[PDB]
């Protein structure tokens with residue numbers, strides 16, 4: 098609401114520049130997944146119906162700035178879009194000098210990342226991009242955490258800057274979980290290290306009633322509670338930090354359900370056999386690879402009560418069937434909850450696909466760092482410039 102959306106701007110007979118996420122996997126000049134191209138169809142369709150000309154801008158892969166590289170050209174993506182849309186898509190390689198388009202037509206620019214000044218958002222390149230159209234639309238959330246000429250700089254100099262369909266929905270789903278969640282609110286933070294999720298843990302610790310820690314993160318908390326972890330993956334350096342997190346959670350009346358029991362193994366492979374053990378019975382030679390059935394029950398209880406769920410990780414190495422029970426019971430609890438659920442991160446997405454509960458999750462973010470920076474409570478430069486340019 099703080100920024101303008103597609104419905105708040107005049108798109109009739111205007112050159113409309115759209116920053117999309119067409120960072121799709123390519124193999125031998127052919128797209129192996131069309132998911133992200135299918136996602137931006139409503140945004141493209143809407144502009145076309147309003148009477149404007151669409152100018153698509155995107156990044157692909159990791160090319161070196163200031164150089165052209167055919168293995169990262171958006172040419173196969175332009176052909177892929179024309180197939181899905183059924184509408185002709187002109188591919189512009191000389192788009193910076195000029196772009197020629199007529200209402201009802203779609204034009205695909207060559208990869209932005211080739212241009213000098215893109216990563217640093219140079220005012221030189223930002224003004225050149227802004228001069229190509231009348232309105233700027235930002236539809237690529239996965240890149241909203243980076244200030245770049247085609248995600249941030251163009252919005253400074255273009256006459257009109259707004260947010261597209263995908264970006265408006267992503268910010269709305271995330272803000273419905275973070276800014277003012279219907280209580281109770283439960284967050285699940287799982288991963289290999291407390292260090293990589295510390296900022297997520299400190300930001301959520303203030304906004305939730307339930308904070309479930311999982312995997313390597315949970316193991317560090319098990320060590321903080323005084324229990325022996327043996328050969329389990331944990332960060333010794335952060336034990337003092339996780340000890341403080343448990344103290345602040347106590348003071349703020351947050352339920353951090355540290356596992357009461359675990360599933361331990363003597364080998365890290367898909368052939369190892371689970372041994373259900375109380376947290377206090379972990380031997381030196383053993384490693385915690387999943388939670389126990391008592392810890393699953395505690396989690397299922399707490400998520401049944403919740404009206405908002407924020408899921409960022411598993412509770413076990415679910416890639417191993419013998420250590421998948423914990424993440425299965427967690428996924429099934431989230432599915433049964435009917436709470437507004439927001440999921441993000443690769444393991445969470447793999448857990449959702451493996452346990453086939455994708456429909457039963459209200460929102461699934463496919464963003465990486467952009468999703469994590471938002472969960473950390475940080476300002477996303479692409480979003481902030483749209484807020485400024487929305488003021489009248």
Ligand SMILES: Nc1ncnc2c1ncn2[C@@H]1O[C@H](COP(=O)(O)OP(=O)(O)O)[C@@H](O)[C@H]1O
Nearest residue numbers: 288289312313330385386410413414442443444
């Ligand atoms: N008990 C555990 N011990 C070791 N590794 C685990 C355990 N539980 C889960 N993992 C694995 O650790 C990885 C989590 O790392 P991370 O990349 O931070 O997760 P994400 O970024 O998707 O939230 C996952 O691959 C997960 O399967």
